[PDB]
Every structure is written in C-alpha cells, then in structure tokens.
Amino acid sequence: PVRFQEALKDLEVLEGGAATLRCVLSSVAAPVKWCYGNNVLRPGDKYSLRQEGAMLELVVRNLRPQDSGRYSCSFGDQTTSATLTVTALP
Template identity: 40%
Template sequence: LGLHAICFFLNLVEILNLYVCFTLVIPAEFTKALQNQEVKEGESVTLMCEYSIPGVQFVWRKGLETLKSSEKYHMRQRKSCISLIIHNLKPEDSGNYTCICRDQRTMATLTVNGIDIDCYENKIIVFSFDLKLRNQMAEEGNSIILHCEISKPDTPVQWRKGSNLLRSGEKYKIRQRGCMLELKIFNLTQDDSGVYSCTSETTETSANITVSGKLVQFTSKGYQ
C-alpha cells in the first residue's frame, strides 16, 4: 500500500509540472483583433476583442484620450472577451479606438455617418422644414411660441437668436416631438426682439420677432 501511494504521489507531481509548464508557455497576445466599423448617427456600436489570458487588466483609448465607463461608454469583460459599447453615436465619435492589455494593443477605426442625408434607390434626400417659422409680434411681459416641422423625425437641431445658441432654462423652453419643433420664450422684453432660427446640419428656417412695449393708460380725475 505504501508503494502504491508513493507512485501515485510521483505521478501527481509529474502531472502538475506538465500543467505548470503548459501554462507558462501560453503567449500573452490578442487572439481576436478589433474590427473597423461604420455606423449611423444615433445608433450604438460594440467594439470587441479577445486576449489570450482571461481577466487581464485593460485600457480603452480614443486617439490619445483614455476612456472611462460612463453613460457614453460601457466597458465589459467576460473571461477572454473585452468589449466597449458606445451609445448615442455622433459624427465626432469617429476616430481610432485602441484596446491595450499589458504591452499589447489592437486598434480599429470607427466611422459615424450623419443622419441628415439618406439614400433611397440611389437618390439622395436632403431633409427640409415642411413647416417653417413665421414672423410674429408680441407685447412686452407676455410669452410667445415659435414652432416648425422637419421632414425627418428626431433630427438634431439647434435654436439661435442671431448667432447666440439658445438652451432650455427659465427664459427659454425647447421641445421636440418627432417632426415637431418648438421654442417658447417667457416674460418678453423689447430686448427679445430679433431674428430666431432653427437649424439642422443641412437646412434652416428663421423668423423675425418684434416685441412692443406695454401701453400705459392715463386716467384723469375731475376737480370740483
């Protein structure tokens, strides 16, 4: 019985040595590289690669910028698989993305195409405003609503007064529902008079708003 135990122990040691040697010769490298991708604005994309050693630490970069997990970027790792999910893509998200593990790296190019222009049956359609802004007059102290409609639902737009970009707040309320676009201006003053515009990347509509001062009424009392 003692001899059998010794033989079993020696065989076990030999198996462990072979396992250790096999483990040590596994090369540390990317077994699946990143692939170039081309997607549309507003979509999400997943960049994925695989590394030979599971659970290894990794870093994602766009150009020279190191990326961190956020609402924009979602980083995942499952065994040897490493992925980066980019949400709500915009044209400025285009560029070179790199995954770095130890001293190894893999890179791919992401191209994000804008959504203002679509192609149907080899025809290029440029989205336009079906309902344009109209000139309006209002009295000081009141509110006013500017509205228009664009042919492509949920197209990104910007509202401006002259060259100044407008944002929602106490003074302005910006709404977009499908094709309908709306700007509401509160507590009007004569300084709010001017040209207001709604623009996308390829089209624009504008209107002139005139704010008049409040009429002051004088009352006279008779004297006896």
C-alpha cells in the same frame, strides 16, 4: 434627407407674455439647434426647447423688448429663420 417642411413665421407679441416660435421637419429627427442672431440658445429659464414628433417649438418666456429680433432653427445643413417683434404694453 431631413428638411424644414414648414418654415418659422414672423411674429408680433406683447411685452411680458411668452413667445412660441414653431416650425416643422419633414420627419421626426433630432437634435435641432435654435439661435438668436448667431447665438446658439441653451434650454433654461428664458428659453424652453420643445419637440412633438416633427413639430418644433421654442418658448421665449418673460418677453422683454431686448428679446426681440431674429431667431433661427437648424438641423444638419438645413435652416429656417424669422423675426420676433415685441410690442410695448399699455
């Protein structure tokens, strides 16, 4: 049964950049679901959902302070979660 072998990590990123949230599955499986709080994310201009084998990646583009908070990744019954902190640009 597929598990998150490597959990999501808490990150701190500057405003305006791109945040890359990464985790790893115990085998190559799909599809995974990404969430911000309890909201399931849709691939679009804001979020890019990427997969490279067992490596999973969420790109949060055009980072604003409102994009900060808890993100999660889920597959079947398994979940992993971390927080994104956004730091204001000088």
